[PDB]
Amino acid sequence: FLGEEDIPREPRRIVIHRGSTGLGFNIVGGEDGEGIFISFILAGGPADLSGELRKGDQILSVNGVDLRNASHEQAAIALKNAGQTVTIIAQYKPEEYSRFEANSRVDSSGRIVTD
């Protein structure tokens, strides 16, 4: 029933409490201000358990630190050093994301499809 509803494109706040364990997602991007995007979310990891992040989300900030224009390595450092409670502002940007992943495109509901 859900799969035809448009994925919301407004920014959201996500709070993940992960102690001293990994967040459980991978990032792509960071070159020349392209943005930092979630590319993979580990099943059973803290990001998965949040239920509030998906592939193709841009990370706008972590703990108030603006990552819109971050480099890949400094983004990764910000995330890994954010502390036990990690407050992410995210925004779903599937068109931008789709340019990174082979054979990917965005459908009418905003979902990323890979042929």
């Binding site: 990994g22 997602f25 991978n26 990032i27 792509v28 890949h72 390595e73 990764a76 995330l79 890994k80």
Partner: peptide, 6 residues
């Protein structure tokens, strides 16, 4: 090209 696990 980079991908980092966090």
């Amino acid at each position: 090209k980079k991908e980092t696990w966090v």
